[PDB]
Amino acid sequence: GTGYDLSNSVFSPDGRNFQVEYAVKAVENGTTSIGIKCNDGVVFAVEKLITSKLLVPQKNVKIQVVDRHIGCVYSGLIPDGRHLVNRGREEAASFKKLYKTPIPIPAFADRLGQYVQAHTLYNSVRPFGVSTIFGGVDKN
C-alpha cells in the first residue's frame, strides 16, 4: 500500500527510509558548501546568500569550530547543523576529558555518524536536514 513516508523509522517495500530522503531534499534546497583536502590540512568554504542590503557583512558566521582543530560547515537547515555541532563539541570535550589527547578526525566522524544514525531509528525524532562537511589535522 502507501503511507510509508509518513513515519521516520518505517521501512518502505524497497527497503528505503523516505523521511531521511525527504531530509536530503532540504539539503539540496539549501546553500552550497565545500571542502578541500590539501597536502597538510583542510580548507572549508561556504556561500552566504545576501537576502538584503540590511544584512551586516562578515557577521552571520556559518562555519563552526569544534574543539580547537576541527572545522564544520553544513548545507540545509542551519539550526539542525548547530544542533549537530553542539553535540560534536560535547563529544570532543568528553574524549579530551578521558583520553587527554584531542579527538582524532576519524574518531570525531564516527561520533557524529552514530548520533545522526540514531535519529533514523525512532519515529519520535526527525532526521537531520543537513549534510555536514568537516575535518582537521590530528596525530597522522
Binding site: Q58, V65, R68, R89
Partner: protein
C-alpha cells in the same frame, strides 16, 4: 570531605603602576617529603591573565583542565575571541569563585588557595583571592599560606595602600617579589629554591619567567654559632 595529599606552598603577588606580578615555587610536597620539583603552579590563561594555585596538586590539575576548557568554550561561535570578546581576568576569577563556593557547599571542596592576576581590557590591574571556603578579597598585595604571614609584611612596605600603586615601578615591584621568595626559602620548610615568576603589563604584555633561583643568600654567620647556650667550641 577530603584531605590534601600532594601540596604546593605560598603564591605571592602584588600590583604596580602598569600591571601585576605573581610568583610561586616549583615544588610538589608529599607531607614532609619534598617529592616533585618540576611542578608549574602558575597557569597563564590567554595573554592577559595568570592564575596561581596553592594546595592540592590533583585539584590544581583539575582547575588547569577547567581553564583550558574555558578558552575552548569562549572561542566557540565567537569571531572576536582574540579581540573584544576575549577572556578577561575578571571573567576567569568569577567563574573559579563560583566553582570554589559551590564545591564547599556540596561539602566536597577543591583544597586550594587561588590568586588570579591580570590586566583588564581598559588597562586596570586585577588581583583577587579565592580559597577552598569560597572567600574572596582584593588587596594591593596578596599571598597564600606562609606568604600571607611573611611576604605580605614585606610587600606592604612597598605598597601600603591604593595611592602607592602608581608610585611603584616594575623594577621595584619585582625586586620585592624576588626578596620575598628568598625569605620564604629561609623560613618555610615546604619551600623550593627554584621558582616561576609572571609579569602582566598593560604595555609589554605577559612575561613568563621560568627556572628562577634564590640567590645572594646569607649563611656565613652560621659558623660563629655553636652550641645552644653555654658551649664555647
Amino acid at each position: 570531605t577530603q584531605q590534601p595529599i600532594v601540596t604546593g606552598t605560598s603564591v605571592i603577588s602584588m600590583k604596580y603602576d602598569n600591571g601585576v606580578i605573581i610568583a610561586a615555587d616549583n615544588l610538589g610536597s608529599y607531607g614532609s617529603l619534598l617529592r616533585f620539583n618540576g611542578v608549574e603552579r602558575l597557569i597563564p590563561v590567554g595573554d592577559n591573565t595568570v592564575v596561581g594555585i596553592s594546595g592540592d596538586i590533583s585539584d590544581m590539575q583539575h582547575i588547569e583542565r577547567l581553564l583550558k576548557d574555558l578558552v575552548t568554550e569562549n572561542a566557540y561561535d565567537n569571531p572576536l575571541a582574540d579581540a573584544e570578546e576575549a577572556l578577561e581576568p575578571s571573567y576567569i576569577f568569577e567563574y573559579l569563585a563560583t566553582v570554589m563556593y559551590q564545591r564547599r557547599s556540596k561539602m566536597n571542596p577543591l583544597w586550594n588557595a587561588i590568586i588570579v592576576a591580570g590586566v583588564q581590557s581598559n588597562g586596570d590591574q586585577f588581583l583577587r583571592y579565592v580559597n577552598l571556603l569560597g572567600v574572596t578579597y582584593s588587596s594591593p598585595t596578596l599571598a597564600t599560606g606562609f606568604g600571607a604571614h611573611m611576604a605580605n609584611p614585606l610587600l606592604r612596605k612597598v605598597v601600603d595602600r591604593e595611592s602607592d600603586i602608581p608610585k611603584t615601578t616594575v623594577q621595584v615591584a619585582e625586586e620585592a617579589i624576588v626578596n620575598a621568595m628568598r625569605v620564604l626559602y629561609y623560613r618555610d620548610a615546604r619551600s623550593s629554591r627554584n621558582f616561576s615568576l609572571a609579569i602582566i603589563d598593560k604595555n609589554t604584555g605577559l612575561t613568563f619567567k621560568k627556572n628562577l633561583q634564590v640567590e645572594n643568600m646569607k649563611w656565613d654567620f652560621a659558623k660563629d654559632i655553636k652550641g645552644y647556650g653555654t658551649q664555647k667550641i
